[PDB]
Nucleic acid binder design. Sequence first.
DNA 1: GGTTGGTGTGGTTGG
Length: 116
Amino acid sequence: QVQLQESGGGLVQAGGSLRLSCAASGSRFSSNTMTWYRQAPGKQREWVATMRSIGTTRYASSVEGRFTLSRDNAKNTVYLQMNSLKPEDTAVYYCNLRRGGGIYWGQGTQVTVSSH
DNA sequence: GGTTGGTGTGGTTGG
Ligand SMILES: [K+]
Ligand SMILES: [K+]
């Protein structure tokens, strides 16, 4: 069926940059809405970004101008480029994809940003 | 729980 596989998490220094990938199988990103969320240590889950089937993007106020979404249809993969990272960005990052009446989730990947 | 956490039926996300 439908499965999402996230990759790219790890440890980085403040001010650094890294890219998360969300690779889909069983359904195309270009068919539906995909979303990123993050879950920081002492916080509730928060929206990060959305890309619609048509490729249009929206970003949360806490990441706008630093994070950007792109999509490779031939690899059925969506990328979250995370620039100018801050310790406040430390969290588990999730991606999901809608398909029909269901929502399918990646396994989550930890990003840890060390203080300067 | 789930194909996903947890301060679990809200959450730029259903029940
Ligand atoms: K640190
Ligand atoms: K839930």
